[PDB]
Amino acid sequence: QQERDPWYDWDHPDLRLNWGEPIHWDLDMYIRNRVDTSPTPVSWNTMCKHLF
Amino acid sequence: MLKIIIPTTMLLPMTWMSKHNMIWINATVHSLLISLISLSLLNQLGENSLNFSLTFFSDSLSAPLLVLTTWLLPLMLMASQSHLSKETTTRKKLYITMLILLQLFLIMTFTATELILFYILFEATLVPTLIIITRWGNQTERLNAGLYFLFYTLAGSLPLLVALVYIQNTTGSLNFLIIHYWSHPLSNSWSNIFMWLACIMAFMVKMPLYGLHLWLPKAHVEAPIAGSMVLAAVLLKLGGYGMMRITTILNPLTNYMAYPFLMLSMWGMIMTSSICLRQTDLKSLIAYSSVSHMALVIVAIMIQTPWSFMGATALMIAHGLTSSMLFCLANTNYERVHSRTMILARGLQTLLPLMATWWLVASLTNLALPPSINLIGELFIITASFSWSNITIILMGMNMMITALYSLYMLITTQRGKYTHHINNIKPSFTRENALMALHILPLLLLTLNPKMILGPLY
Amino acid sequence: MKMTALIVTIMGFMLALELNNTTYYLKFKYPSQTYKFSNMLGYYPSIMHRLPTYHNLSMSQ
Amino acid sequence: PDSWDKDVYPEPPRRTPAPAPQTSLPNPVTYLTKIFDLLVDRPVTLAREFIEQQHAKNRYYYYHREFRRVPDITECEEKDILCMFEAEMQWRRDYKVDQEIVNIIQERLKACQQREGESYRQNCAKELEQFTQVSKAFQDRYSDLGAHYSARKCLAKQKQRMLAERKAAKEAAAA
Amino acid sequence: YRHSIFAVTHVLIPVWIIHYYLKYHVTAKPYTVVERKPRIFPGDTILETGEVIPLMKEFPDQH
Amino acid sequence: SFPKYKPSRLATLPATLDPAEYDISPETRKAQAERLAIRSRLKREYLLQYNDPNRLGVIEDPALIRWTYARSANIYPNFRPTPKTSLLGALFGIGPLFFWYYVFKTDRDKKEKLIQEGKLDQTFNISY
Amino acid sequence: GAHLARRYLGDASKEPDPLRMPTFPPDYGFPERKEREMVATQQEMNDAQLMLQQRDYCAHYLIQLLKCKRDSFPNFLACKHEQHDWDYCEHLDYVKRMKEFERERRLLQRKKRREQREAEMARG
Amino acid sequence: EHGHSKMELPDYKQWKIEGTPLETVQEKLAARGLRDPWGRNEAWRYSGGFANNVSFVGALLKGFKWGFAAFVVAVGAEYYLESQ
Amino acid sequence: AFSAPAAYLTHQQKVLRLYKRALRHLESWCVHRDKYRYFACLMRARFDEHKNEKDMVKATQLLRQAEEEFWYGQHPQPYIFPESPGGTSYERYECYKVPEWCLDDWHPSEKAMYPDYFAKREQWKRLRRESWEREVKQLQEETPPGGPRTEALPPARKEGDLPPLWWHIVTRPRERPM
Amino acid sequence: SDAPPLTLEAIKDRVLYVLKLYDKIDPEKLSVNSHFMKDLGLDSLDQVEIIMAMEDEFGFEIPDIDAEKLMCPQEIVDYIADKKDVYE
Amino acid sequence: MNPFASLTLTTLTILTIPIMMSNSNIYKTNLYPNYVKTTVSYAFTLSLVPLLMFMHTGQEMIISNWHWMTLQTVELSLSFKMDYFSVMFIPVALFVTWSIMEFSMWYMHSDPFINRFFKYLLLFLITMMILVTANNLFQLFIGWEGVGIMSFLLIGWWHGRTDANTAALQAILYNRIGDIGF
C-alpha cells in the first residue's frame, strides 16, 4: 500500500484504498505500518551482498 | 461461608420481585454489597486454611478468585445494561438470573472441600454459560459455538469423574485435607499413566491447552459481552485451580508426564501470539491473547515450584481483570459501529480521548508493564522456568516481544491514524462505560500495592 | 601518540572541508557504490525491515 | 536505637574523622547544613515531641505469641491424622522461622557490603562465611521438596541423605 | 511573593515530611539506611574516641 | 548503457521501468478505459451514499465483508487434503514440538547427571 | 608501536609475550637484587579504602592527595604539588616497567645468541 | 499581537545577474549557445547582506580577537601582581 | 489531487513528468544555485534536441532509455518538501482534523457559547438539505446511461443550483485546524 | 510558527513577481489573466519551469496532475489559495 | 540528621508534585508549562546540595525505606542507591531538562496539547530518575520500561502521521529485544 499513488483522492487516504474495490488477501501485512515492497535505488541482490 | 452464599441466593427473589425499571439498580447495589462482604475472606493464615465446615473451606488460592468472581457480577450487569434495553422485563430478569446462578456456582465451586462436589459444580457452571451464549448471542454461529464450548469440556470431564470415583474406591476419601495428608507416590505404571491423564486433561481442556483451544475463539466471539467477560475472567481459571488442587496426588509421575504438555504450551504461546499479529477481529485477537497467557500459566503449574505457583496465581488474577477490560472496550466500539472489525473504525483517539486513555492503560497492563501484577506473575513464572531449564528463556523472550508487538498493534490500529470519513454515528462516551473501565482498572493498580494478597498459599 | 587524537581530528577536519569545497565546481558525476552504501545506512534498514518481518507475518497467517 | 537488638544486627563503632580546615575560605557545606538544621530539623523535632507526649498520654501494650512444642512427624503413627496435623503445623512454623533467619543473615551481608565500601571483599568475609553456612543448612533442609511440600517429604529427604552419609562413612572406614 | 509561597508549599513541606519519615520510621528499623564508613587518613582524629592515627613512614621526599 | 536494476519480491519493479506500459495497443486502451469506468462507478456510488444528509451510521462495504469472510470462514470448506498441505501441516505442527522436546530433555538429562555426580556447585541456590 | 611490527612480521622468539613476562629468574642478571620498598601498611591503606587497582607502590602520594582534597575542599585547586608527586611516582613505576620489558628482551636476545653460538660450535 | 504591517515587495528591476556567479554561469552558457531564463530570479541570494561570505576558519575564529585581547590583559595583570 | 485522473497518460505527459523528476533530482544533486542553474539549462538543452521528433516508435525508444538513465542516477535521498508525501511533516496535523458533524453531539451548555456560529451552521444545514435533493435529480439526469466513465462531476447549470456533491468538499476541516 | 496570514493580494503579488523575473516574459505585456500557451508563446517545458518557480517560492509542492492544467497566473493564484485556505 | 538522605529523596519527591496537580485547575490554564519548568529548576538547585556533600566528604548511602513483598528468603523493598553515579547524574539531567523545557515553551507555543507535552516530559524525567537511583533489579526494570513507554508515547506525538507510529513501534520492538537479555 505504500507504493500506491499518494496524490489520488482515496476514500481512505491513510490506508490508500477506495470503497468498493477488491481488497488484497494480505492487506493487513501491507498497511504502510509494516513490510512494504516499494522499489529501491539499489537492487535487492546488490544490497544483500554489500551488507553481508 | 454461608454469609456469602445466602445473599447470592437471595439475589434471585429480589431480582424477580423488583419493579420493571429497577432491576439493574437493585442488582448492581446488592452485588457490590456482596463483593464488599466477600472481601473479608482475604484474611488468611500461614497455617493450613480457613476451614469453615465439613463442606466449605477457604484458602489464599481460593480467596482472590472468590473476590474476583463476586466483583465481576456488577461489571457484567453494567455492561449488559446497554444492549438489553429493547428487551422484555421477563427476559432481562432471566438474563440476570443466569448471571446470578453462574456466580453462585462459581462461589460454591471455589470452596468445595470435596472433589466430587467440586466436579459437580465445575460442570454445573456449564449450563448458564451455554444458555447465555446460545440465547443472547447476535450472529448465527452462536449455536455452533455453544456446541463446541460444551462438547470439548465434556470430552475432558467425563473421564475425570471416572478417575475420581476410582480414587475414592482405593484411597477411601476425596476430601482435600485427607488427600493431602495421606498422599502416596504414584508408581510408574500404565494404569497410573492413564489415571494421570484422566485427572489432568479435564482441567487442561478448560485453560485451554494449545491443541485443545479451538472452542475458545468461537465462544468468546459469539457470546454477548457479559458471557465474554465471565469466560475470559473466571471460567478459564477453573482449570488452573483444578490442576493446582489435584497435582498433589500425581507426584512423582508429573515429572515424566509433563513433557508433552510443557512442549505444547511453550510452543503454543508463541503460535497464538503470532496469530494475534494477523487478525481482522478484535474479539478473536483478545481470545488468542487469553490463550497465550493461559499457556504460560499451564507451564507454571506443570513445573510445580513455589515460585511457579505464586506467579501462576498472580497471572490468573491479572489476566482475568485485563481481559475483561479489553472485551469491554471492544464492546463499546462495537455498540457504535456494529461491525466488530478492527480496520474499519479508525482514528478514535481524536473523537473519544478518554476512551483512548482507557485503551492505552489496558494495552499497557496486557503488555506486562512493571510493576503491574501481570509483570509480577510473568516474571515469577519466567524465573521458575529458567531454574527448570535455562533454554526456556528464549521462548519466553520471544513471547514477550510478540505480546508487546500485538498489544501496541491493536492500540495503534483502532486509536491512531485518520478517522474513517463515512462513519458519523460515534457519540460521546457515556458515564456508564467510563465508570466500567475505571472499575476494571483501579483494582489492578491497587493490587500492585499489596501483591501478597494474590500470591497464593505458597507465599 | 599523545597528539594522535588531535592530529586525527584536524586531519578529518581538513579532509572533509576540502571534499566539501569541491561542490562549488561546475562539474557533476554520478555517485559511487561507497556513497550509496553510506547514504542508505549500509542497506541495513532496508533488508532487515523487509526480509524478517514479511517472513514472520506471512507465516503468522 | 533501642527499637532493635544490637547483637542480632551488629555494627562497628563507626569511627569518623575530625574537620581539618586547611584554608580560611568558608565551605558551603557547614553553612548549608546549619540552615537546613534550623529550617527543617527543629520543626520536625517539635512535632515529634508533641506526637510522643500525645502517645504517652495513652499507653497500651501488645504481646508476642508463644507456642508450645508438639511431637513432630517422627513420633506420629502411620494413619493417626491428629498428630500428623499438629506436626505439619509445627513444621510449617519452623520453616517460616528458618526463612526469617536466612533473611536476617542476608540483611547482615548486604549491610556489610554497603558499609565497608571499597574494601568489602576483605572486610566482609565473616558475613560471607556465615551466609554460606546458613544457606548450606537451609538448602539441605528444603531445597527440592517443591510445591505440595510436607513434613513427610522433608523427613524422607533427611532419611535418604543420612542413609547416603552412613553408607559413605562405612565405606571410608572399611576402605 | 509567588516564589515565597512556592518554596514553602513545594520544598519546605515535602522536605519536612520526608525528613520526619526517614528520621522516625525508616531509621527505626535496622539496616534501612546504611552509610559509607567515611575514609580514615593518617593524622586524623576521631571525635568518638579522641585518638589520632600514626603518621606514615617518612618516605624520601624530592621533586 | 547503465547497470540493470533487478526487481525482487520485496523491491518490486518501478512503474516507469516496466516493458508493458510502453507497448500500447487499442485493446490495452479499452482495458484501461473500462477499468476507469468500473472505478468511477464505484466512486459515484460511494459519494452518493456519502454526501446524503439523511444518512446516519456506517456505509457498509461489501468488499470488506468479503475480505473478512474469506480470511476467516471460507478456509475449511475450500480445504482439500493434499500432499503439499499434509506435509506442510505435519512439519509446521509436529517438528517444532519434537525439536524442543529433544532440546529440553537433553538439557535436563545433562543437569541430572551433573547433580548426581555432585559437580554442579549449587551454592546459594535456595529459591526455585 | 614498532615492537608489534617486529613481533608480528618478524619471528616470535626474539621478543617476549606480555602475558608470561618475566620468564627468567630475577637475579639472573645481577646478584644483589634489591627489594622494592613500601610506605603504606595494610591498616591505613585499607582505612583510606582507595581501590583494589589503586593499591600499588605509589599509594602514599595518593593518600596525601586525598587528604588535600578532603581538607581544602572549596579550593579545589589548592593542592597541586601532591597531584604532581603522585603523577611522578606513577611515571617512575611505568619507567621501571619499561626497563623490565627491555631487560627481559635483551636477556632473550642474549640467550638466543648463546644458543646459536653453541650450535655453531657443535656443527664445526 | 501579530505581524500586520502591510509589507511591500521590492522592485523587480533591482535584481541583476551582474556581479554574481550567475554571470559566470551565463558566460559559460554563451560559449555553447545557451542562456538561463531564470538567472535574475535567484540574484537576491547574492545581493544584500548575503553578498559577503566568511571562510570556515574565519567562522571557527568568531571571537578570537576579543578573547586574545582579554587574555593578554589578564596575563599582564597577573604578571604585574605576582611580581610583588 | 483535486482533478480527476485520466484513463491513461499520453506521451507528452510522460515526457513532462520525467522532465520534472529529472530537474528535481538534479537540484537535489547540485546543492548550490549557480551549479544547479548551469546543469539545468544543460539538461533542458539535452531535452529539447528531440523536440521535433515525429517517429512514434523512435519517440517511445526515447524517454525510455531516459527513464533507465534517471533510475541509475536518481539521488537515493532526494529533497522532499516538508508537507509532501515523503516530507518530515506530511501528516503532522492530521490528528487535529475533527469532522464537522461532531458539533451536532455537543452539549447545549457548550452550544450556549458560540451562538452565532451555530446559527450560521443551521443556515448551512438548511442549504445542504435543499441542495442535495436538487443535486440527486441533477446527477441522475446528467449522467450517461450504464454508469459514469470518468469520475468527474458536472457543475451547476441552473440559478439556485449548487454543484453536485459539494458538502464534503466545501466543509474540509482546515489545512492547519490547530 | 509566527507566520503572517498571507492573503490573496500577497499571493498574486508574489506570483507576478516571480513571473516578472522570468526574462522569457516581457514584464509590460504580462497580465493576471494572460495565458501561457497563446498570450505569451511559451513552451510546455516553460510552463513546467514556471511550476518549479512557484513551488520553490511558496514552499509547497504541486502534484503533476494539477500542475499540468494550470495556464494562467490567476488560476495558479486561485489553486494556491484553495490549497492554503485563504479567506480574502 | 545527615540531610543527605532527606535532600536526595526530596528531589525525586518534588519532581512528582506537578503530576499530582495534573488533575487540578492549573492544568487547564497556560501557566502549567512554567509551573513544570520552575519545579524542575527548584529540583535541580535542591539536588545540587548532596553533590556538594559528596564532593566534600565522599558520602555514599543506601535508603531501603519501604518494604514490598517478601518471597521466602528473598526480600523485595523500595530501596534507593545514592552513590557517586546517582548524585552526579541527577543534577546534570535536571539541568538539561530545565533547559529543554524552557526551550519547549517557545518551540511548542502553537501546540494545542502543550500541557500534556510537559506532563509527558516530566513523566519521562521521573522514570529516568527511578532508573538511575535504583538499588535492586526490579526497580531498575521499572525505570527501564517506564522510559521506553514514555519514548513510545513521545515519538508518536503526532498520532495522525503513519511514520511516527511506525517509529514508535520500531523503538518498542528493539527495546523488547533488549528486555529479553534484561
Ligand SMILES: CCCCCCCCCCCCCCCCCC(=O)OC[C@H](COP(=O)([O-])OCC(O)COP(=O)([O-])OC[C@@H](COC(=O)CCCCCCCCCCCCCCCCC)OC(=O)CCCCCCCCCCCCCCCCC)OC(=O)CCCCCCCCCCCCCCCCC
Ligand atoms: C598509519 C598512518 C596514518 C595516516 C593514514 C593516511 C592519512 C590519510 C590518507 C587518506 C586516506 C583516505 C581518505 C579519503 C576518504 C575518501 C573520501 C572520498 O574521496 O569520497 C568520495 C569518493 C566517492 O564520492 P562520490 O560517490 O562521487 O559522491 C558524490 C558527492 O561527492 C557526494 O558528496 P556529499 O556532499 O553527499 O558528502 C560528502 C561526503 C560523502 O563522501 C563519502 O561518500 C564517504 C565514503 C568514503 C569515505 C570514508 C572513509 C573511511 C573508511 C572506513 C572503512 C572502514 C572499514 C569498512 C570495510 C568494508 C568492507 C566491505 O564526504 C565526506 O563528508 C568526507 C568523507 C570522509 C573523509 C574524512 C575522514 C576519513 C579519513 C579517515 C580514514 C582512515 C584514517 C584513519 C585515521 C587514523 C590513522 C590510522 O569516495 C570513494 O571513492 C571511497 C574511497 C575510500 C573508500 C574505501 C571503501 C572501499 C571498499 C571497496 C571494497 C574493498 C574490498 C572488501 C572485501 C570484503 C569481502 C568480504
Ligand SMILES: CCCCCCCCCCCCCCCCC[C@@H](O)O[C@H](CO[C@H](O)CCCCCCCCCCCCCCC)COP(=O)(O)OCC[N+](C)(C)C
Ligand atoms: C490434539 C492436541 C493435544 C492433545 C493432548 C496431547 C497430550 C497427550 C499425550 C500423552 C503423553 C504420552 C503418553 C504415554 C507416555 C509414556 C512414555 C513413553 O512414551 O515412552 C516410552 C514408551 O515406549 C512406547 O512409547 C510405548 C507406547 C507406544 C504406543 C503409544 C502411541 C504413540 C503415539 C500416539 C499419540 C496419539 C495421542 C492422541 C490419541 C487420540 C518409554 O519406554 P518404556 O520404558 O517401555 O515405558 C515406560 C512406561 N512404563 C514404565 C509404564 C512401561
Ligand SMILES: CCCCCCCC/C=C\CCCCCCCC(=O)O[C@H](COC(=O)CCCCCCC/C=C/CCCCCCCC)COP(=O)(O)OCCN
Ligand atoms: C479433551 C479431550 C481428551 C479426552 C481425554 C482423554 C484422556 C483420558 C484418558 C482416557 C480414558 C481413561 C480413563 C481412566 C480412568 C481412571 C481409572 C484408572 O486409571 O484405573 C486404571 C484403569 O486404566 C484403564 O483401564 C485405561 C484403559 C483405557 C480405555 C479407554 C481408552 C480411551 C482412549 C485412550 C487413547 C488416548 C490416550 C491419550 C489421550 C490424551 C487426550 C487426547 C487401573 O484399572 P484397574 O484394572 O482397576 O487396576 C488394576 C490393575 N492394575
Ligand SMILES: CCCCCCCCCCCC(=O)SCCNC(=O)CCNC(=O)[C@H](O)C(C)(C)COP(=O)(O)O
Ligand atoms: C540526474 C538524473 C538524470 C536524468 C536523465 C534524463 C535523460 C535526459 C534526456 C531525455 C531524452 C529526451 O529528450 S526524450 C524525447 C522523446 N521524444 C519527443 O519528445 C518528441 C516530441 N516531443 C513532445 O511532444 C514533447 O511534449 C515536447 C515537444 C518536448 C513538449 O511538448 P509541449 O509543447 O506540450 O510542451
